[PDB]
Design a protein around this motif. Sequence first.
Motif, mmCIF file in Angstrom:
data_model
loop_
_atom_site.group_PDB
_atom_site.id
_atom_site.type_symbol
_atom_site.label_atom_id
_atom_site.label_comp_id
_atom_site.label_asym_id
_atom_site.label_seq_id
_atom_site.Cartn_x
_atom_site.Cartn_y
_atom_site.Cartn_z
ATOM 1 N N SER A 32 0.819 -1.209 0.000
ATOM 2 C CA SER A 32 0.000 0.000 0.000
ATOM 3 C C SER A 32 0.853 1.259 0.000
ATOM 4 O O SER A 32 0.307 2.347 -0.107
ATOM 5 C CB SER A 32 -0.942 0.039 1.167
ATOM 6 N N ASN A 33 2.167 1.093 0.180
ATOM 7 C CA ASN A 33 3.103 2.200 0.200
ATOM 8 C C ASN A 33 3.648 2.468 -1.207
ATOM 9 O O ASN A 33 4.495 1.736 -1.704
ATOM 10 C CB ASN A 33 4.224 1.923 1.189
ATOM 11 N N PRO A 34 3.217 3.548 -1.887
ATOM 12 C CA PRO A 34 3.643 3.820 -3.258
ATOM 13 C C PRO A 34 5.035 4.446 -3.302
ATOM 14 O O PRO A 34 5.518 4.810 -4.373
ATOM 15 C CB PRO A 34 2.617 4.866 -3.727
ATOM 16 N N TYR A 35 5.659 4.562 -2.124
ATOM 17 C CA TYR A 35 6.965 5.173 -1.966
ATOM 18 C C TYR A 35 7.994 4.133 -1.516
ATOM 19 O O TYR A 35 9.188 4.410 -1.476
ATOM 20 C CB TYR A 35 6.892 6.353 -0.991
ATOM 21 N N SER A 36 7.533 2.928 -1.180
ATOM 22 C CA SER A 36 8.412 1.906 -0.632
ATOM 23 C C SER A 36 9.636 1.657 -1.527
ATOM 24 O O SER A 36 10.755 1.621 -1.033
ATOM 25 C CB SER A 36 7.638 0.641 -0.338
ATOM 26 N N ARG A 37 9.425 1.491 -2.839
ATOM 27 C CA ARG A 37 10.490 1.129 -3.769
ATOM 28 C C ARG A 37 11.380 2.333 -4.086
ATOM 29 O O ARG A 37 12.473 2.183 -4.634
ATOM 30 C CB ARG A 37 9.937 0.532 -5.070
ATOM 31 N N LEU A 38 10.907 3.538 -3.763
ATOM 32 C CA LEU A 38 11.751 4.700 -3.945
ATOM 33 C C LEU A 38 12.655 4.883 -2.726
ATOM 34 O O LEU A 38 13.829 5.199 -2.874
ATOM 35 C CB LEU A 38 10.880 5.927 -4.202
ATOM 36 N N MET A 39 12.101 4.667 -1.531
ATOM 37 C CA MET A 39 12.810 4.891 -0.282
ATOM 38 C C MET A 39 13.768 3.728 -0.048
ATOM 39 O O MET A 39 14.581 3.754 0.875
ATOM 40 C CB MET A 39 11.840 5.003 0.902
ATOM 41 N N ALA A 40 13.657 2.711 -0.908
ATOM 42 C CA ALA A 40 14.589 1.603 -0.860
ATOM 43 C C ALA A 40 15.983 2.109 -1.243
ATOM 44 O O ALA A 40 16.983 1.557 -0.793
ATOM 45 C CB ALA A 40 14.100 0.455 -1.720
ATOM 46 N N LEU A 41 16.037 3.189 -2.036
ATOM 47 C CA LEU A 41 17.306 3.775 -2.441
ATOM 48 C C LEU A 41 18.119 4.188 -1.215
ATOM 49 O O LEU A 41 19.342 4.241 -1.304
ATOM 50 C CB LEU A 41 17.092 4.953 -3.401
ATOM 51 N N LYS A 42 17.440 4.457 -0.087
ATOM 52 C CA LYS A 42 18.069 4.973 1.125
ATOM 53 C C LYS A 42 18.861 3.876 1.820
ATOM 54 O O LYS A 42 20.013 4.080 2.171
ATOM 55 C CB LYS A 42 17.061 5.575 2.113
ATOM 56 N N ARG A 43 18.234 2.718 2.021
ATOM 57 C CA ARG A 43 18.861 1.641 2.773
ATOM 58 C C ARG A 43 19.775 0.837 1.850
ATOM 59 O O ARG A 43 20.324 -0.184 2.243
ATOM 60 C CB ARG A 43 17.844 0.808 3.576
ATOM 61 N N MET A 44 19.956 1.331 0.627
ATOM 62 C CA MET A 44 20.882 0.712 -0.305
ATOM 63 C C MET A 44 21.989 1.690 -0.688
ATOM 64 O O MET A 44 22.722 1.432 -1.631
ATOM 65 C CB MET A 44 20.153 0.278 -1.575
ATOM 66 N N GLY A 45 22.054 2.827 0.015
ATOM 67 C CA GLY A 45 23.145 3.781 -0.087
ATOM 68 C C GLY A 45 23.361 4.296 -1.506
ATOM 69 O O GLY A 45 24.490 4.630 -1.867
ATOM 70 N N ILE A 46 22.277 4.335 -2.291
ATOM 71 C CA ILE A 46 22.233 5.122 -3.508
ATOM 72 C C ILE A 46 21.915 6.575 -3.149
ATOM 73 O O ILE A 46 22.661 7.485 -3.504
ATOM 74 C CB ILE A 46 21.264 4.532 -4.552
ATOM 75 N N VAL A 47 20.804 6.798 -2.443
ATOM 76 C CA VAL A 47 20.410 8.155 -2.096
ATOM 77 C C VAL A 47 20.149 8.174 -0.597
ATOM 78 O O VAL A 47 19.264 7.474 -0.129
ATOM 79 C CB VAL A 47 19.168 8.623 -2.885
ATOM 80 N N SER A 48 20.926 8.967 0.145
ATOM 81 C CA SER A 48 20.868 8.966 1.601
ATOM 82 C C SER A 48 19.671 9.767 2.126
ATOM 83 O O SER A 48 19.169 9.486 3.211
ATOM 84 C CB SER A 48 22.172 9.446 2.184
ATOM 85 N N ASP A 49 19.202 10.747 1.342
ATOM 86 C CA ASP A 49 18.155 11.669 1.760
ATOM 87 C C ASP A 49 17.058 11.751 0.692
ATOM 88 O O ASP A 49 16.826 12.820 0.132
ATOM 89 C CB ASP A 49 18.745 13.047 2.103
ATOM 90 N N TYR A 50 16.370 10.630 0.414
ATOM 91 C CA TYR A 50 15.434 10.583 -0.706
ATOM 92 C C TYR A 50 14.248 11.531 -0.518
ATOM 93 O O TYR A 50 13.797 12.137 -1.490
ATOM 94 C CB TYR A 50 14.913 9.182 -1.041
ATOM 95 N N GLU A 51 13.765 11.652 0.730
ATOM 96 C CA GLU A 51 12.552 12.387 1.061
ATOM 97 C C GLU A 51 12.678 13.860 0.679
ATOM 98 O O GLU A 51 11.672 14.535 0.539
ATOM 99 C CB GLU A 51 12.134 12.214 2.525
#
Lengths: 278, 283
Positions: free
Chosen positions: B15-34
């Motif tokens: 139900s989270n349409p942001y889950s796969r975007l914020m995944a970038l954070k815990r994969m050290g692509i983008v530290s501050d996605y929000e």
Amino acid sequence: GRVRIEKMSSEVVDSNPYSRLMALKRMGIVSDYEKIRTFAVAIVGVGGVGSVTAEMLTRCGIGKLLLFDYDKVELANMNRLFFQPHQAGLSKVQAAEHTLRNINPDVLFEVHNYNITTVENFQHFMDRISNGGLEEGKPVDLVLSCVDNFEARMTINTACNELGQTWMESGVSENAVSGHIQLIIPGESACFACAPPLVVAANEGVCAASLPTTMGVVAGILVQNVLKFLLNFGTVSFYLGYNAMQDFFPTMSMKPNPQCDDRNCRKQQEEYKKKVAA
Amino acid sequence: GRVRIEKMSSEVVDSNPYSRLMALKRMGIVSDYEKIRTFAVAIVGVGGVGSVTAEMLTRCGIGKLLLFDYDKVELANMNRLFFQPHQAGLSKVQAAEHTLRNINPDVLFEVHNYNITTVENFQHFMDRISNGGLEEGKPVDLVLSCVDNFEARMTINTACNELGQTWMESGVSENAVSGHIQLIIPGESACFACAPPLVVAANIDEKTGVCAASLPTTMGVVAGILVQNVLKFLLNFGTVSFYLGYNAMQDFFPTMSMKPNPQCDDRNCRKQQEEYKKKVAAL
Ligand SMILES: Nc1ncnc2c1ncn2[C@@H]1O[C@H](COP(=O)(O)OP(=O)(O)OP(=O)(O)O)[C@@H](O)[C@H]1O
Ligand SMILES: Nc1ncnc2c1ncn2[C@@H]1O[C@H](COP(=O)(O)OP(=O)(O)OP(=O)(O)O)[C@@H](O)[C@H]1O
Ligand SMILES: [Mg+2]
Ligand SMILES: [Mg+2]
Ligand SMILES: [Mg+2]
Ligand SMILES: [Mg+2]
Ligand SMILES: [Zn+2]
Ligand SMILES: [Zn+2]
């Protein structure tokens, strides 16, 4: 609103959804574009890459699309293109058919809401590769892997080696910032079992990251390769990678392994070498 | 349908349409996605490139989009992505806004159904660049030129040199099989007047009442690399390109950096270059 069109027109009017495509003819880029109406493409995986690939082909006026996917649209898919929130809950193939039919009523559709790796489904899947062409009983002209896992890719591989079916495989990194397309002509080029995967970038309760950007680039290059292959213009790539971090697009050509695990790949290579000395 | 989300979440649920975007954070692509939520981007031309660009930013969770376009959707646009045939006759900005609002309710929109090039419209356009930011009175973070003609491109250039506004210019050829993106930081990189486009594209442009051809594929690729560049610029990951071309016939993607021309036609580009050189001399 769009009515069904019997023969593609060059006519430069606001009402012609094909005017800017048929324009490729007068400009000598693609001399027989209307041929696009004579082909059928199967797509396995109508997710991030699959759906945009389907959209692109539909807007181009492909004759027939065959969509295979076992998953439903979810809100977690809304980070990627094509599917909209009102489609959440429908099966991907059904949502896709619905929208795409609306986009281009000239395109034929055949959709299947199953996993292709189970025993019963696989026999069916193969039957539809062989007989699900534009004319029933003739094979599809191209298969497109846009699935997200080894098992499924391997399955398409097994099927295509047995049938001698040209296909393209597409992938996107779990970190979202790289992807590739690859052309597989069994016997002539490396099949998916022939070698380890080609990467273009270095390196259980969670998910892969995805971006609408990367998916759009990959679908883009994928369908571009399809058009070039079917419509015989430009140069087809056998491999085209995309590294989003560096803005880097490596090409390659993967030659068959003669001790490939897949006995059918071996057999196809044999057949190719025979045909080659004419 | 999709519900408004106040605070983006990493929570991996269907139900989270942001889950796969914020995944970038815990994969050290983008530290501050929000941080994506804090930016405003203006898009001039909501056609083949623009519409997909808009969609890409919308799904990403951009803070605010300003859409500028003077044209209605036509069936002749149905070869390119985004717009559907039932939207024929609507203004592009109207059709876009409606659809985008559906796709992501969290994104703010300001739409403008006019021609950027006319005298009165130009003034308004500059006002919106300066003040149409996420907070009223503050400027937009980025302007994206997704127009299809020299006149509009040059107008944006003039605007952005005077305002000192960083922007990206994107284009697709009339023959459909090539295109490019360019990052313009007035004074630091070449502006649009700094160099001739025919020269810039000499290595990508295939050479042939004709109307322009277009392809969904090429627009998809250009919009793709364009937004990928926007994300890398604003979110500060990867390497930003100052120029990235695409030749579709040969799968060739040249990059170059382009330094500003000190004899630029634009007096403001020249003034900005001075300003920049001073700022480096006192760093
Ligand atoms: N055996 C299979 N048969 C049919 N379709 C498959 C198979 N394996 C994977 N796919 C499909 O390939 C598609 C492409 O995956 P994508 O990663 O874009 O979507 P997703 O799996 O829902 O996303 P996420 O992984 O973020 O949840 C998915 O829709 C998936 O259902
Ligand atoms: N001065 C301008 N102000 C605002 N929008 C503009 C300006 N000039 C061009 N545009 C818009 O940029 C968009 C991008 O063009 P695109 O080629 O994708 O669509 P189109 O021009 O309708 O298509 P076609 O050229 O096939 O008829 C168009 O919608 C066009 O109206
Ligand atoms: Mg899923
Ligand atoms: Mg997946
Ligand atoms: Mg128009
Ligand atoms: Mg145009
Ligand atoms: Zn093999
Ligand atoms: Zn300049």
